Amino acid sequence: RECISIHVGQAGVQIGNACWELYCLEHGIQPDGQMDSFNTFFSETGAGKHVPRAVFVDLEPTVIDEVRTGTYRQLFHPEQLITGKEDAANNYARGHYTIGKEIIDLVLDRIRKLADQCTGLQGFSVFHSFGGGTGSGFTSLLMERLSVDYGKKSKLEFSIYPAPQVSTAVVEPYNSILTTHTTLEHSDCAFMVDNEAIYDICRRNLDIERPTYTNLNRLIGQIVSSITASLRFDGALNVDLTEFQTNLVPYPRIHFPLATYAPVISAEQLSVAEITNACFEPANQMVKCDPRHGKYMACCLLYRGDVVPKDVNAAIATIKTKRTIQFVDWCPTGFKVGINYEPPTVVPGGDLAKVQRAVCMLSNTTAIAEAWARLDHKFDLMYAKRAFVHWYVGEGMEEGEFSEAREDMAALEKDYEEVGV
Amino acid sequence: ICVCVRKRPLNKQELAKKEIDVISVPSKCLLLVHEPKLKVDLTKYLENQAFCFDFAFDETASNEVVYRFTARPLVQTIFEGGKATCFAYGQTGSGKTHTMGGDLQNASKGIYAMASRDVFLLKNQPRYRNLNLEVYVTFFEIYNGKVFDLLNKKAKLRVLEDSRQQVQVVGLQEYLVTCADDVIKMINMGSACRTNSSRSHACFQILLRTKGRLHGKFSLVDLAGNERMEGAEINKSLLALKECIRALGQFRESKLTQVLRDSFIGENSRTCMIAMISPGISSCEYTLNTLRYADRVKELS
Amino acid sequence: REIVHIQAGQCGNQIGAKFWEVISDEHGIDPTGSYHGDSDLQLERINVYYNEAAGNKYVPRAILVDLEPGTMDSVRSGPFGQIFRPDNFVFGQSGAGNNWAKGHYTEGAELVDSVLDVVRKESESCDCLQGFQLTHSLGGGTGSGMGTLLISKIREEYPDRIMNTFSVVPSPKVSDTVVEPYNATLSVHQLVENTDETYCIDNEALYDICFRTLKLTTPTYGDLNHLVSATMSGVTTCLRFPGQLNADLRKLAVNMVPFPRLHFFMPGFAPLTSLTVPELTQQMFDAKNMMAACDPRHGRYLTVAAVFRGRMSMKEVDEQMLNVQNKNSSYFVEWIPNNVKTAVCDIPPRGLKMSATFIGNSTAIQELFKRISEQFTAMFRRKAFLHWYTGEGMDEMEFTEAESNMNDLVSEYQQYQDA
Ligand SMILES: Nc1nc2c(ncn2[C@@H]2O[C@H](COP(=O)(O)OP(=O)(O)OP(=O)(O)O)[C@@H](O)[C@H]2O)c(=O)[nH]1
Ligand SMILES: Nc1ncnc2c1ncn2[C@@H]1O[C@H](COP(=O)(O)OP(=O)(O)NP(=O)(O)O)[C@@H](O)[C@H]1O
Ligand SMILES: COc1cc2c(c(OC)c1OC)-c1ccc(OC)c(=O)cc1[C@@H](NC(=O)CS)CC2
Ligand SMILES: Nc1nc2c(ncn2[C@@H]2O[C@H](COP(=O)(O)OP(=O)(O)O)[C@@H](O)[C@H]2O)c(=O)[nH]1
Ligand SMILES: [Mg+2]
Ligand SMILES: [Mg+2]
């Protein structure tokens, strides 16, 4: 039925800022206010306005302040925008303990103020950074507590895996490992987004020498749109969360599906068979790695626009003939195909053009663990000397919690590899 | 698989009604049925039929003698870690309960008791002492596809079977016994609240356990008469039993065969079938039916 | 002597709706009105499928069940929407399911009584009740889960009379849910225990017939239902029509099912899509023409029952019908004597000048059970989407208990390819 969006911390906020704008454009809601189906994400407030079911939280104003500034200012309620004066400082230990504690009760209560006008809520979609102050810290704490106040209700996280070039912070790897540990036993399914992969797609495709955040976010916007879409329009693909995940995660170990967007092509018609063909192409992923190496244990195809199954079929047939199928031992050959006739609308001054048809493909491969390694190594190697640990012990964390968390990442990397044939 | 037949003597009622005894057992493996017949012209004659079994017992054979050549040789099987089953099969009033449970009443004089007696004797033998086993007993009856714990006041139990297919009887009560007198107390208790007369399947079990694991198990079964349409469940179980036993030396399931499934699937499993026969001329058709069923069972050996 | 018809869950409702409007025009019945058509027969046994009310009117003895309005109002504002008795519809309102559990325990039980209490009215109204027949799907849940429940509760109130079902067994192609195998297996078990005869309409078979042999590209749920709907009229003909047999439906049972375990029939139809006789038999006995994904070759027939249709000479039929179990005389179990019976009726179906239909209790059906048990143990392996049921109240071992019962059914059918 219903569906709350939560955006915590800079990356979280800005990403959502850009996909709540693609949402509006998709459903045609003039910023100001007005124009079920569209109801999954909005609450028809007042006798005009349309307003989102979202909450934005950051531990410094800055980011949120620009939201209450640029158009869309009217779009939200003043309450759904929570801000916190003192910064997260860039260390989980602060976001999860010291500085968080102070704002958790006020957020927690407001999101419940939102869930109250929702006859039979469904779950939360949460957007946050992997490394990064409050993105790691506060998130982790939110999720712990959301699990206390909302037993069943699923939690779908949209995480941003950090990458050297689209500037990180030295301590980033600590933060990532840290949150992903606590946060793991509390999420149902999470969508990782490698900032290197998106920086990468903006280069090979959009042809931008210096990709901005505002440039990256736009693209991510689209991937997210295509992911939710199904449950916004409505009678189409992955209906009512649950049957969304029941489709991708075979094991409680929160599995992170690998996302691949269809045709990304700059402004200023691609064949149904061709875009599917571009979906089994590493250069177009969302997490830098490669599944021609690992195995697949559940494939998903989410189309949008002008498409008849008649082709989608013949495109699959030929997509297996001269390709690396490599499906895993004990699991069918998935391919829950979903088509959503509603065409892919893109932002007006955007860098990508209108497209006749687009695909999405969400696969849960074992090769996604190649990213869990790339992070562990960084962490392991710094921790080898307590590199920056003292800043965390400083806010009140135990040196043990650092072990205890990497300890899980050692385990996860094992599980992932263990699923192989 | 071992198949035997036991003829019971004519009882008071039958002798009084002047019932003719039409059964002879001239040797330890041969049973003769002197079947009365009439030619078309009404002339009386005998079609004397012969059946051969591993062991054929006459009317003078006591329960101890019968026990010695049927269930006794199976006790060792459970100490060797196998699964043994002994079935008493035949018509209503043929001697099934008398043989397995005691004369009638007297538990000690029946196969359940005698088998228990030898289980305690063997466990104390050097070759088995070091096994450090504990002896457990169970007593349940199957009536219309339903299982009832006779040691837990006819409590109706549930029978489940995963996908791997082993069966489990949820709630069946296992009682620790350390003496034959113990076993005799559980047999009296169970027989006291059983649904004499058939209508059910009786099954008294002797289990051997050491450490969380089952070492061996012996299931002694007192079957329902082989001769209100519940006879359909009884006939299906008997048909199912036959195929399970034959499958041992090489469906259309029923409760009985579902519960005893694990005792026919293992490679280290033995079974003995004892066919009870009422010697009276009036029961000749029931006898032939019992004997032919028996023939097909041993046919797999 | 007289039968009531329960019809539940989106698929069932749609399937049966076509059945109804198909036999109704066979008998010559208006959306409400009565007879109209120069035929005279029809009305003899119209009794059997139609409790008749006020004035002329005919109103079918049908109960409509679902756990979400939509599908029902699809019928009402549809083909013969006006035909069914108003308070005979039983709405659900709440969440559907598409998860067995919900329909056989939580959201299911909720309704049961209000339906049971309406079947109870129809039944007790019957002059001499013959039994019930229900249509539903085995995959999904608002009819595969409430249905198997509805029937578990009909026996108990009606051990007496017999239970008949047309159940659509689902496939990997043309399916809405990843869970179907769970829903399927969970019902198959139930059917085995409380029904006398069950017809298997495999959707895999169904799709194959439309595209693999009918040039029909995208198979709607529409031209697909047209197959099932035509088949269902063929299968019942002898109980709704002449004065050749009469069909106690119990006679049909006692004669088609040699073994208790309710044996499942694979049906087959003669001409098709939306006919010499030798040409008709050759087709009606062809795998390429069965309603279940099987292939009687990889298995013998226990008993077969065939029913022709249209003005044709039985002299030829009895001749050709012998000529099949001759050129194929190895595939008819020889431990059951005259195990293949044929009935002829002379009132043509829709279009079709000639027609035939086929009912087969064949050990090849084993093939079908094996393939759903293949995706089941293939998912219940590393306990898949299972937490969706655990949650609605079910126990982990109630799955193994179903799986176990089901494989036996395979291990029994495979036991009877004996001698
Ligand atoms: N894709 C994307 N990544 C971002 C964006 N903004 C920051 N990041 C990334 O997010 C990570 C840092 O997270 P932050 O949002 O700055 O951390 P935060 O604590 O949540 O926010 P602050 O309180 O401002 O420190 C790094 O991986 C950055 O590359 C954005 O707008 N889009
Ligand atoms: N070998 C035997 N010697 C003396 N009496 C016997 C013998 N076998 C059976 N009887 C008696 O004959 C009757 C049959 O007993 P049991 O009670 O043994 O029958 P089933 O158990 O054969 N009958 P049922 O329960 O009806 O299927 C009882 O009264 C026994 O005491
Ligand atoms: C006083 O203002 C400064 C503040 C900071 C940084 C810095 O050095 C470039 C400054 O200039 C002197 C800074 C520093 C250090 C880092 O590691 C060496 C880092 O990763 C990152 C940074 C700066 N942040 C970033 O580059 C985020 S993408 C933020 C903290
Ligand atoms: N042929 C036939 N099969 C159907 C139809 N609708 C659904 N099915 C099949 O039946 C299964 C479940 O049907 P559904 O009606 O959605 O389940 P319900 O919630 O119990 O009503 C699906 O997996 C399909 O394979 C139908 O219209 N006709
Ligand atoms: Mg921060
Ligand atoms: Mg007895």
Q: Are C372 and C169 in contact, with CB atoms under 8 Å apart? A: yes
Q: Which of C163, C154, C164, C127 is nearest to C52 (CA)?
A: C127
C23, C163: one domain = yes
Both tokens of C286, joined, read: 């062809």
Both tokens of A69, joined, read: 């500034």
Distance from CA of A90 to the nearest CA of C (A): 38
> Of these residues, A86, A185, A243, A399, which one is catalytic?
A243
Q: Are A167 and A135 in contact, with CB atoms under 8 Å apart? A: no
SS3 assignment, position B50: strand
Q: What is the resolution of this structure in A?
A: 28.0
Give residue A387 CA to ligand 1 midpoint distance, Å: 22
> Given A243, A309, A330, which is nearest C381 (Cβ)?
A330
Residue B165: closest CA among chain C residues belongs to which residue? C404
Q: How far apart are CA A18 and CA A223, in angstroms?
A: 12
Helical residues (DSSP H) of A248-369, grouped into ranges: 272-277, 309-321
Q: Which of C183, C211, C220, C385 to mutate to test the interface with A (most CBs of A within 10 A)?
A: C385
Angle at B139 between CA B138 and CA B145, to 5 degrees: 120
Buried b (16+ CB within 10 A) or exposed e, B219-250: bbbbbbbbbeeeeebbebbbebbbbbbbebee
Q: Are A368 and A378 in contact, with CB atoms under 8 Å apart? A: no
Q: Which of C360, C225, C372, C249 is nearest to C305 (CA)?
A: C360
The secondary structure of A353-381 as a DSSP string is: PP-SEE---EE-BSGGGHHHHHHHHHHHH
Inter-axis angle of helices C10-27 and C222-240, nearest 10? 50
Q: How far apart are CA A241 and CA A253, in angstroms?
A: 17
Spatial CB neighbours of B18, under 8 Å, sequence gap ≥ 6: none
Report phi then psi at A161, rounded to 5.
-75, 125
The alpha carbon of residue C401 and the mean position of all alpha carbons in its chain are separated, in whole angstroms, by 25
Q: What residue owns the CA closest to ligand 1's atom 31?
A: A11
Q: What residue owns the CA closest to ligand 2's atom 1?
A: B8
Report phi then psi at C122, rounded to 5.
-65, -40
Q: Strands A336-340 and A154-161: what pairing?
A: unpaired
Regarding the beta carbon of C9 and ligand 4, being less than 6 Å apart is answered yes
Q: Which ligand is nearest to the CA of B9?
A: 2
Q: Which of A239, A238, A202, A245 is nearest to A220 (CA)?
A: A202
Distance from CA of B295 to the nearest CA of C (A): 19
Q: How far apart are CA A387 and CA A381, in angstroms?
A: 9
C38, C124: one domain = yes
Q: How far apart are CA C327 and CA C281, in angstroms?
A: 12
Written as one letter, the residue type at A299 is C
C404–B236: do the CB atoms touch at under 8 Å?
no
Q: How far apart are CA A176 and CA A373, in angstroms?
A: 12
C202, C271: one domain = no
End-of-domain residue from the set C258, C283, C317 = C258
Q: How far apart are CA A345 and CA A24, in angstroms?
A: 10
Q: How far apart are CA A113 and CA C116, in angstroms?
A: 43
Question: How many CB atoms sit inside 10 A of residue C252's CB?
Answer: 20
Q: Strands C264-269 and C355-362: what pairing?
A: antiparallel
Distance from CA of B166 to the nearest CA of C (A): 8
Q: Which of C381, C104, C239 is nearest to B164 (CA)?
A: C381
The secondary structure of A171-210 as a DSSP string is: THHHHHHHHHHHGGGG-SEEEEEEHHHHHHHHHHTS--SS
Angle at C210 between CA C205 and CA C212, to 5 degrees: 75
C49, C111: one domain = yes
Q: With 0-12 CB in 10 A as exposed, 13-18 as middle and 19+ as buried, what is A79?
A: exposed
Regarding the beta carbon of C139 and ligand 4, being less than 6 Å apart is answered yes
Q: Where in C111-159 does DSSP place strands (E)?
A: 131-137
Q: Which helix (H) or strand (E) holds B149?
A: strand B146-149
End-of-domain residue from the set C243, C258, C273 = C258
Which residues of chain A make contact with C215, given a CB cutoff of 8 A?
none
Q: Are B149 and B173 in contact, with CB atoms under 8 Å apart? A: yes
Using a 6 Å CB cutoff, which residues line ligand 2?
Answer: B 8-9, 11, 92-98, 103-104, 196-198, 225, 276
Q: How far apart are CA C147 and CA C145, in angstroms?
A: 5
Find the discontinuities in chain C where C to next N exceeds 2.5 angstroms and give the residue preceding each: 274
A358: left (phi > 0), else alpha (psi -120 to 50), else beta?
A: beta
Atom of ligand 3 nearest to the CA of A167: 28
Spatial CB neighbours of C129, under 8 Å, sequence gap ≥ 6: C1, C2, C3, C4, C123, C158, C161
Q: Which ligand is nearest to the CA of A58?
A: 1
Q: Which ligand is nearest to the CA of B60?
A: 2
Q: Strands C355-362 and C340-345: what pairing?
A: unpaired
Q: Where in C287-375 does DSSP place strands (E)?
A: 301-309, 340-345, 355-362
A332–C217: do the CB atoms touch at under 8 Å?
no
Q: Which of A341, A314, A396 is nearest to A101 (CA)?
A: A396
Q: Which of C399, C380, C383, C98 is nearest to A252 (CA)?
A: C383
Regarding the beta carbon of A202 and ligand 1, being less than 6 Å apart is answered no
User: Annotation-wise, does B82 bind a ligand?
Assistant: no
Report how far apart the first and last C-alpha atoms of chain C are (Å, whole number). 38
Q: Distances in Å between the alpha carbon of A268 and those of A68, A207, A214?
A: 32, 11, 19
Instruction: Verify cis geometry, omega within 30 degrees of 0, for the bond prior to C196.
Output: no
Radius of gyration of chain C (CA): 21
Q: Strands A189-194 and A300-305: what pairing?
A: unpaired
Q: Are B117 and B71 in contact, with CB atoms under 8 Å apart? A: no
Q: Which of C204, C135, C205 is nearest to C167 (CA)?
A: C135
Q: Distances in Å between the alpha carbon of B161 and those of A241, B167, B169?
A: 33, 4, 9
Q: Which residues of A line the annotated binding site for GTP?
A: 9-11, 14, 60, 88, 129, 132-135, 168, 172, 195, 213, 217, 241
Q: Which of B270, B251, A379, A248 is nearest to C178 (CA)?
A: A248
C305, C187: one domain = no
C405–B161: do the CB atoms touch at under 8 Å?
yes
Enumerate long-range contacts of B140-144, CB under 8 Å, 24 or more apart. B140/B169, B140/B172, B140/B203, B141/B194, B141/B195, B141/B200, B141/B201, B141/B202, B141/B203, B142/B200, B142/B201, B142/B203, B142/B237, B142/B255, B142/B256, B142/B259, B143/B195, B143/B199, B143/B200, B143/B201, B144/B230, B144/B233
C380–B163: do the CB atoms touch at under 8 Å?
yes
B252–C404: do the CB atoms touch at under 8 Å?
no
Indicate the DSSP class of residue C344: E
Angle at A352 between CA A348 and CA A354, to 5 degrees: 70
A401 a catalytic residue: no
Q: Which ligand is nearest to the CA of C203?
A: 4
Q: Distances in Å between the alpha carbon of C49 and those of A181, C128, C356?
A: 64, 13, 21
Q: How far apart are CA B200 and CA C19, in angstroms?
A: 46
Q: Are A154 and A241 in contact, with CB atoms under 8 Å apart? A: yes
C332, C369: one domain = no
Domains of chain A: 1-257 (3.40.50.1440), 258-367 (3.30.1330.20), 368-421 (1.10.287.600)
Regarding the beta carbon of C365 and ligand 4, being less than 6 Å apart is answered no
User: Annotation-wise, does B102 bind a ligand?
Assistant: no
CATH of the domain at C324: 3.30.1330.20
Q: Are C122 and C51 in contact, with CB atoms under 8 Å apart? A: yes
The alpha carbon of residue C250 and the mean position of all alpha carbons in its chain are separated, in whole angstroms, by 16
Q: Strands A154-161 and A189-194: what pairing?
A: parallel
Report phi then psi at C334, rounded to 5.
-95, 5
Question: How many CB atoms sit inside 10 A of residue C167's CB?
Answer: 29
SS3 assignment, position B4: strand
Dihedral sign, Cα of residue A304, residue A305, residue A310, residue A314: negative
Q: How far apart are CA C396 and CA C373, in angstroms?
A: 17
Distance from CA of C203 to the nearest CA of A (A): 18
Within 200-239 of C, beta carbons closer than 8 Å to B belong to: none
C19, C166: one domain = yes
C345, C315: one domain = yes
Q: Distances in Å between the alpha carbon of C90 and those of A351, C15, C21, C65, C72?
A: 54, 17, 20, 5, 9
Report phi then psi at A302, rounded to 5.
-115, 95
C83, C196: one domain = yes
Task: Please give the tally of structural domains in chain C.
Answer: 3
Regarding the beta carbon of A170 and ligand 3, being less than 6 Å apart is answered yes
Give residue A202 CA to ligand 5 midpoint distance, Å: 25
Solving technique: cryo-EM
Sheet of A300-305: strand order equals: A336-340, A300-305, A357-358
Q: What residue owns the CA closest to ligand 2's atom 17?
A: B97
Query: Tokens 């029939």 map to which residue?
Result: C265
Indicate the DSSP class of residue B106: B
C396, C414: one domain = yes
Which residues of chain B make contact with C415, given a CB cutoff of 8 A?
251
Q: How far apart are CA C9 and CA C68, in angstroms?
A: 9
Q: Which helix (H) or strand (E) holds B64?
A: helix B63-68
Q: How far apart are CA C345 and CA C310, in angstroms?
A: 6
Q: Are C356 and C400 in contact, with CB atoms under 8 Å apart? A: no
C412–B251: do the CB atoms touch at under 8 Å?
yes
Give residue B7 CA to ligand 2 midpoint distance, Å: 11
User: Annotation-wise, does C391 bind a ligand?
Assistant: no
Which residues of chain C make contact with B162, given a CB cutoff of 8 A?
397, 399-401, 403-404
The secondary structure of B204-240 as a DSSP string is: EEEEEESSSSEEEEEEEEEPPP---TTHHHHHHHHHH
Report phi then psi at A384, rounded to 5.
-55, -10
B161–C380: do the CB atoms touch at under 8 Å?
no
| B/C interface, count of CB pairs below 8 Å | 40
Let me know if chains A and B touch, i.e. at least 3 Cβ pairs under 8 angstroms: no
Spatial CB neighbours of C90, under 8 Å, sequence gap ≥ 6: C63, C64, C65, C66, C111, C114, C115, C118
Both tokens of B134, joined, read: 């504990």
Query: Tokens 């009856």 map to which residue?
Result: B141
Q: How far apart are CA C355 and CA B186, in angstroms?
A: 68
Q: How far apart are CA B204 and CA A203, in angstroms?
A: 79
Both tokens of C387, joined, read: 């937490």
Q: How far apart are CA A296 and CA A366, in angstroms?
A: 7
Q: How far apart are CA C128 and CA C96, in angstroms?
A: 35
Atom of ligand 4 nearest to the CA of C15: 28
Both tokens of A214, joined, read: 């505002």
Q: How far apart are CA A230 and CA A240, in angstroms?
A: 9
Q: Are B274 and B88 in contact, with CB atoms under 8 Å apart? A: yes
Residue C387: closest CA among chain A residues belongs to which residue? A246
Q: Strands B83-90 and B55-57: what pairing?
A: unpaired
Q: How far apart are CA C115 and CA C63, in angstroms?
A: 8
Q: Which of A1, A122, A189, A246 to mutate to test the interface with C (most CBs of C within 10 A)?
A: A246
Q: How far apart are CA C327 and CA C343, in angstroms?
A: 21
Q: Is A415 on the interface with C (CB under 8 A)?
A: no
Sheet of C340-345: strand order equals: C89-90, C62-65, C3-8, C131-137, C162-169, C197-202, C264-269, C355-362, C301-309, C340-345
- Give me the numbers of helices (H) and strands (E) for chain C, helices first please: 15, 10
Within 220-249 of A, beta carbons closer than 8 Å to C belong to: 242-243, 246-247
Q: What residue owns the CA closest to ligand 3's atom 29?
A: A169
Domain that includes residue C204, residue range: 1-258
Buried b (16+ CB within 10 A) or exposed e, A189-225: bbbbbbbbbbbbbbeebbeeeebebebbbbbbbbbbb
Within 384-403 of C, beta carbons closer than 8 Å to A belong to: 384-385, 388, 391
End-of-domain residue from the set C345, C364, C383 = C364
C206, C275: one domain = no
Chains touching B (3+ CB pairs < 8 Å): C
Q: Which of C174, C119, C176, C171 is nearest to C142 (CA)?
A: C176
Both tokens of A143, joined, read: 């999720």
SS3 assignment, position A309: helix
Distance from CA of A345 to the nearest CA of C (A): 27
Both tokens of B249, joined, read: 């030396």
Q: How far apart are CA A372 and CA A374, in angstroms?
A: 6
Helical residues (DSSP H) of A68-157, grouped into ranges: 92-93, 99-114, 133-149
Q: How far apart are CA B215 and CA C398, in angstroms?
A: 28
Find the discontinuities in chain B where C to next N exceeds 2.5 angstroms and give the residue preceding each: 104, 195, 227, 250
Report phi then psi at B92, rounded to 5.
-55, 130
Q: How far apart are CA C299 and CA C292, in angstroms?
A: 14
Both tokens of B77, joined, read: 């099987």
Q: How far apart are CA B130 and CA B151, in angstroms?
A: 30
- Total count of residues recorded for chain B: 301
Distance from CA of C373 to the nearest CA of B (A): 10
C279, C250: one domain = no
The alpha carbon of residue A405 and the mean position of all alpha carbons in its chain are separated, in whole angstroms, by 22
Q: What share of chain C is helix, strand, coil (3-state, %, to 5)?
A: 40, 15, 45
C382–A251: do the CB atoms touch at under 8 Å?
yes
The secondary structure of B156-198 as a DSSP string is: EEEEEE-SS--EEEETPPPEEESSHHHHHHHHHHHHHT-----
Query: Tokens 């007879």 map to which residue?
Result: C35
